[PDB]
Curated annotation (Swiss-Prot), chain A:
Effect of residue 7 to Y: In strain: Alpha/B.1.1.7, Beta/B.1.351, Gamma/P.1, Theta/P.3, Mu/B.1.621, 19B/501Y, Omicron/BA.1, Omicron/BA.2, Omicron/BA.2.12.1, Omicron/BA.2.75, Omicron/BA.4, Omicron/BA.5, Omicron/BQ.1.1, Omicron/XBB.1.5, Omicron/EG.5.1; May enhance affinity to human ACE2 receptor
Taxonomic lineage from the root: Viruses, Riboviria, Orthornavirae, Pisuviricota, Pisoniviricetes
Renumbered residue ranges of the record's region Disordered: 25-47
Name by which UniProt lists this protein: Spike protein S1
Domain of life per record: Viruses
Function: Attaches the virion to the cell membrane by interacting with host receptor, initiating the infection. The major receptor is host ACE2. When S2/S2' has been cleaved, binding to the receptor triggers direct fusion at the cell membrane. When S2/S2' has not been cleaved, binding to the receptor results in internalization of the virus by endocytosis using host TFRC and GRM2 and leading to fusion of the virion membrane with the host endosomal membrane. Alternatively, may use NRP1/NRP2 and integrin as entry receptors.
Organism: Severe acute respiratory syndrome coronavirus 2 (2019-nCoV)
Subunit structure: Binds to host ACE2. RBD also interacts with the N-linked glycan on 'Asn-90' of ACE2. Cleavage of S generates a polybasic C-terminal sequence on S1 that binds to host Neuropilin-1 (NRP1) and Neuropilin-2 (NRP2) receptors. Interacts with host integrin alpha-5/beta-1 (ITGA5:ITGB1) and with ACE2 in complex with integrin alpha-5/beta-1 (ITGA5:ITGB1). May interact via cytoplasmic c-terminus with M protein. May interact (via N-terminus) with host bilirubin and biliverdin, thereby preventing antibody binding to the SARS-CoV-2 spike NTD via an allosteric mechanism.
Amino acid sequence: YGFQPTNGVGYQPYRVVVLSFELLHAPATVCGPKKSTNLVKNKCVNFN
Amino acid sequence: AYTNSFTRGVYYPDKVFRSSVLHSTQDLFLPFFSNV
């Protein structure tokens, strides 16, 4: 490419990072943060 | 020489637990009655 330093409108490097999300049979390794709450049993509740 | 690998080579296709159900899946398996 070359990417002339000052010149590129279209010509500049766009560092592109792409995150691909994969879910499998297995347990999640990467998960969202904080909120392990007390599990409640025998009651209608929303659960995640 | 070859021997008859009658049934063997089946494994759980996934991590998921299932019970009392007949499930169909497609993976790479050893075909039945194949020569080994």
